[PDB]
Symmetry: C4
Subunit: 461 residues, 4 copies
């Protein structure tokens, strides 16, 4: 009879929860737990996205306002990773002096709720530091020299800092000039909700940088905002977020227990089944359960990081967003397990799994050609094309070209001044596009759609 | 003999009108009615589009002229949903004062036929309203304060409004400043046709908005134009439009009667046929007739809304255009019924219907992956990418990426300042594009083109 | 024996010229004539393109220089079909006065070889014409008023034209102001080749246009250049072009004779062959010969127009370029006849011809859906999208969308201010793209590639 | 027994090196040599790319700074191949005078380590040369006139060069004005590494060019930088690069010997095998070895050019980069030989080789249509479209259109001013896109994927 029991157990382990309830009236509380997990994970992600969106928007708006206030002739958009640049010793001095003067007159210029902030030494003021190669006759040692400009110093009606010997820069040895100051800000966008407003501290540095010594000074503006207590403010939900993240952890922790319990009970049946198939003469490792375990781990980690961020009032949410986003992606991918219960949808999951090994084998061959083209394009078209400047950019450009993106602009960005490089670029682009788009991907398509012929006839039989 | 009669009736119901006329000399006046309906529906839509195009063009041109007249240093294109922005207390005051001064000198500045308009209180002038948080020590109650500036007040040779205590704004509590005025305009573009010119009233508001309190004031210019009687004007087709819309209603109403009569007579034959197949041992619901009924309903509704709009002289034609456009789309789709009479074209309508269920089943699986990627991309790349700012934008970006659109720019819009987010964006984009473009759509293609193998061999047999 | 003669004739008519020479030693002078025709037609087209490219470049460069000289604050690129626009009565007067003043000082401002030209009345000067509605109280009659400003009038040291009653414009009735003048130019780019330089006459009009009466004056600059004799010039190939165009006509005329002779001799064999198949019990109309006849006609017409243009010194080469370009396209398409002699390439011409009827039948069904979407998109998204403004633009936008072009920008160009139209645009774009790109074109592909299965197995058997 | 020996030799020659070592314990030192070659070739290319990237970046940054210093009102981006342009005799004089004045005040304006350089005559100064047609009455001989402006001449407090008769240009005969000077620069970006800094000499020419005589002067700025010894400089790895390039040559030279030895031993076996198949009754030319020989030749040539460049301190690395990049591309393509040892990957290399002849035969037919469309589009749309200006641009535009790139912009770049050309452009673009994208490429796909059906069933059998 134990043979019949083993057969009935193996039949039970292979049927859908709907069929389990139809047959043996076993309630699918694990399925309900998973649906609840989907709903709560998505809810937590959406709430987190909305709140952190608000905070990031406030910080970026303040940074843009600071750039308009302190960078002379700022166009409103960054030239590059740096905000603006100058090419003349006079434009350089005017940019520096403009920044200092705008800081002096901050209260009469700003449109927001800005104020001067105490620095790291607990004194309101402006710090200017400059680095020179100490001296045609220059040593490699950099001579740093700083000055602390108070509000009293800048507010002297005859200004003495402008004429001081500090601001006479020898631009041929200059490495950089850095201006540092602190500002205190309040977002009044929140007080309509009776929430006490959040007070932020901005640590701003303007770097007038010519490490390149190529005739251009690049001006970088960096604003680092942190959240501090509102020391002085009179304006006539932390628990709810924290408990919700605890419920998400508990549910995800419970799903970890149930899935691992399910996997263990599956391996027990494999042990039993081999016994009946050792005397008479991935099936029990569900690949969906591995995905569910990874998703639960990532959701727990992301929730712990989120609670830590909210507890100690931090504003960088990158790593927590990367864990929560990946876990949500995997949860929504794992919903495909419930659809695959209905065999009508299963034949479409099987057609992808069958095509995967041929795709991987084919990527090995196409990958080598792709790498060769990447190296060639970087070494040749690097000095003459902005889509080929470094290797990572070349890889992305070739990927986009394979997908047809921006072909004419890519062809037209090579100036015909060098005839040899122009001819080579034409040959390179034509050969890469023809080869990859018309042999490589056609063979690839052919491999996949026809492998999907066999799953289609294999399920018919 | 009644069996022969039933067979002849079922044979009659299944033959094309061309065959009906060839066999029993029955004139296809229903087909002629449908062709007339196609022609008149398209004619009405084209006439409506041309006229409303004219009106919208006039309104937009006047709005652009107003922005150039009243917004200081307007670049000619909107920065965003708002027209322009300022970052300094002095630029803010100059924008406000420029708007007021340009309104004062309107007659000497405008190039069109503009005049001052009486406001809601029937007095020519300008209204300025400002909102502050009533008072570091601010309450949540907003204190509104308005002033009505007449033409006499602005025309005083020593201007007193500039120096008044109203325009001393405390920008740290300011919520917004709103300037409201009315203008009367005439389009003389019509008088070449003996038509009396249409006189419009523009209700203009300029909003100097800093609800964000982020250091930037956004300036919104909104012009609401309505059509009024020309009270004073001396310049040395309504019936035709209204009757035409009545004929469109009648024809569409008639097509509703005939199609519903046809459907009822079809269900009678189903009743009869089952009787012969209950003793001896969608075919009668034509899916085209459902489309024709929906199209007739939408055309009647759109025509009624159109007549209402023309009767009471309204200028918002959105809902009427959405009904008329959808009804015209459905009419031109329904022309495919006449082509499908010829079986040579029928095998191509059958190949799409057969492929539809597999497409829908496949969308369920691909939709879950798409949703997971949407959530992940929004939560992670939202703060660092303008194509991922909100969920709807992320969905559109992923759709465009699947279709290959703007891949290199999408790859290049992530600044490499955060190495972790940059690496994740690379992984995210590569995985999404590879997965969707090379497994998902290949299986999809394979499903559809091969299902079109079976209709092709199924019609051969 | 006449039966054997008929069979031998039909065998002769169906073999390639290479086989004709291999068998009966018949020289293929017709093939040599066709190769000569290809070479000479392409040569004529290339020479014509190079010369007319030079002339067009000169004219466009002069027009750009004129726009910079006479249009105030010209940005260097046209705003629209019009060059620039103004919105103020003062900017309007300054633009007009700037144009007149720059004309007065032309000799001291121009960088080229420009001079004043006599007008249609043979007098050097400037003409200003203005149109008003003759007079709140305006009649539909337009009152035109012109003034002729001589160089003496503009050169009076106290200028009297500025203060004259002519230039007091009532902008509320103004239709337009037009400024007309002539300039004489010489291109010295030619004298390096001993060719006498070509002297051109520019007829320039500046139109300050506010027919719309919408508050904006659009400024159009039109320069019409013609070539005249150099009356006064001292600088210390017409036959060759004309004879070459005569040889092209002769060769194309000869090819017309030979092809029509070939077609007639083909129809004689059809007559004979039916006689043998009327007692015993496109094959003779070569579709390539129709193409060759059309190409010869077009080349002769284009050459005649080209000779006429060169004879009477005209500078508009549009119609001649459209005939020559189409004839060259058809010649290079007709080269496919020689490749199709080798049966290895023939099976690829047969696969396209076989697929054509299914493509045409399918376009009829897809065309109706395309038309419905075009009408719907124009009526709804016309007022809110610049890619949907008129019907032709909508058709091009839908074509590009089917080919995947600029999908994200199309999705993002609809402002979300109107929620109803925004939702409809989302639904419209998603439905059109999904439908056309994933059912319509998949069925199409499937039709074509599989019809190419049958030609591939039909030639095997 | 010699028959058995011949069979064993032929079996040895056809087995993979892994199988050779598995069977006869023969170490695959040739395979190890090839892997070492891959690693060292890639290493050399990456090092070369990084260093030449640094040098090119320095030169381009200095050129940009020079353009900002000496070109008046330079926008920061080049208008075209020329940097900027002027249209007035006054803007022309101001640009020339601005360049000369900025050169005079170089030491007080530059942000980098710039100094005056001795010219070709070994004298510090500025040279201005002008070309006129010597004199309505102009001869074809160009009269060149130069002036050498010293620092003493420009530094005279009353400047005499401005008022001199040299700078009175007759712009109607002017061909060009050229300003030439030398600058000495040092990149201090290197001294942090104890490397003595590299001193560069810049030979700058500003060309005020109006050869066209079309009313516009184009201003070209060309900077030619070379590396010279630092004559005067006090700042408190050549061998390693040179030896590494020698090892790359040796390894590539060795691979040439081994591959050619392998090919010869292969042809010996062909000779022997035919003997056994001459009495009883590409297989021995490996196509990979041809690729390896070509790659070794190119790597040796590129390394020799690289050593020559580094030895004599040259800064143009184009030809050397084209040889090294092509050789690296071919090395990474040749790695596909090792994967093809495993027959699982071999069937994917065989499917491409089998499809190649059909692709080539098909390109001959499609190429003729492509050429016809190219000629037609250039001759017709050349004067009205910037993507059709010359034949090479037309070819690239049609290639991009076939790949779907920028279709709507291509459709919209034709102004509707000429109705005939506009209609023809619509017809041209629609016909080309429909034809090529929907018949030509569908037949092509069909040819390739189905040929990949036969290799797939041919390897099964
Ligand atoms: C992610 O891999 C890559 C990512 C970025 C660049 C190159 C590659 N690889 C992959 C192989 N080659 C690809 C080149 C262009 C597209 C066709 C080839 N396959 S695939 O689409 O990317 C693919 C990969 C994995 C699963 C499914 C499909 C080239 C090197
Ligand atoms: C309209 O649906 C969508 C609209 C917008 C985004 C996503 C989806 N869906 C649909 C399924 N998935 C699609 C992802 C990219 C394209 C391939 C998949 N099918 S489809 O082209 O859009 C389709 C749908 C219905 C009928 C015919 C074809 C993903 C979720
Ligand atoms: C030139 O015709 C058109 C031109 C412009 C717009 C629409 C159509 N038509 C044609 C049919 N439909 C097309 C819609 C998008 C593309 C697929 C359909 N066929 S096709 O590519 O254009 C084609 C036509 C003739 C021969 C070979 C292929 C839609 C209406
Ligand atoms: C490199 O050749 C070309 C390069 C640039 C323009 C035109 C062609 N040719 C080639 C043939 N025709 C092409 C037109 C558009 C694309 C389809 C046709 N084949 S292909 O992709 O370029 C191809 C070629 C060789 C091997 C594999 C594939 C048109 C003339």
């Amino acid at each position: 009879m134990k043979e019949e029991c083993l057969r009935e157990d193996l039949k039970f382990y292979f049927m859908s929860p709907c069929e389990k309830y139809r047959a043996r009236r076993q309630i699918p509380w694990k399925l309900g737990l998973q649906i609840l997990k989907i709903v709560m994970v998505t809810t937590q992600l959406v709430r987190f996205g909305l709140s952190n969106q608000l905070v990031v928007a406030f910080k970026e708006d303040n940074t843009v306002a600071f750039k308009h206030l302190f960078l002379k002739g700022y166009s409103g958009t960054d030239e590059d990773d740096y905000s603006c640049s100058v090419y003349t010793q006079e434009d350089a001095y005017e940019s520096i002096f403009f920044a200092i003067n705008q800081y002096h007159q901050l209260k009469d210029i700003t449109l927001g709720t800005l104020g001067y902030g105490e620095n790291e030494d607990n004194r309101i003021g402006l710090k200017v530091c400059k680095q020179h190669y100490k001296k045609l006759n220059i040593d490699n040692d950099v001579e740093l020299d700083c000055v602390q400009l108070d509000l009293q110093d800048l507010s002297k009606k005859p200004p003495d800092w402008k004429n001081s010997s500090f601001f006479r820069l020898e631009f041929y040895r200059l490495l950089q000039v850095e201006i540092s100051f602190h500002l205190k800000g309040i977002d009044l966008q929140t007080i309509h909700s009776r929430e006490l407003p959040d007070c932020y501290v901005f640590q701003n540095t303007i770097i007038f940088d010519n490490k390149a010594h190529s005739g251009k000074i690049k001006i970088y503006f960096d604003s680092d905002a942190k959240i501090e207590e509102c020391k002085d403010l009179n304006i006539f939900n932390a628990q709810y977020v924290l408990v919700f993240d605890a419920f998400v952890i508990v549910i995800c922790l419970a799903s970890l227990i149930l899935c691992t319990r399910s996997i263990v009970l599956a391996l027990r049946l494999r042990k039993r089944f081999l016994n009946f198939f050792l005397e008479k003469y991935w099936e029990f490792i569900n690949g969906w359960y591995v995905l569910v375990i990874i998703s639960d781990l990532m959701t727990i980690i992301g929730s712990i990081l989120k609670m830590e961020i909210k507890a100690k009032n931090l504003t960088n949410y990158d790593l927590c967003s990367i864990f929560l986003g990946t876990s949500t992606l995997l949860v929504w991918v794992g919903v495909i397990r419930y659809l695959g219960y209905f065999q009508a949808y299963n034949v479409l999951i099987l057609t992808m799994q069958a095509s995967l090994p041929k795709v991987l084998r084919f990527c090995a061959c196409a990958g080598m050609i792709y790498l060769g083209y990447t190296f060639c394009g970087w070494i040749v078209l690097g000095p003459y094309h902005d889509k080929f400047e470094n290797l990572n950019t070349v890889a992305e450009c070739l990927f986009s070209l394979v997908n047809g993106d921006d072909m004419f602009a890519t062809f037209a960005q090579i100036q015909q001044k060098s005839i040899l490089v122009w001819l080579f670029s034409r040959l390179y682009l034509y050969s890469f596009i023809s080869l990859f788009i018309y042999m490589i991907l056609s063979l690839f398509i052919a491999l996949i759609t026809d492998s999907y012929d066999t799953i289609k006839k294999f399920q018919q039989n």
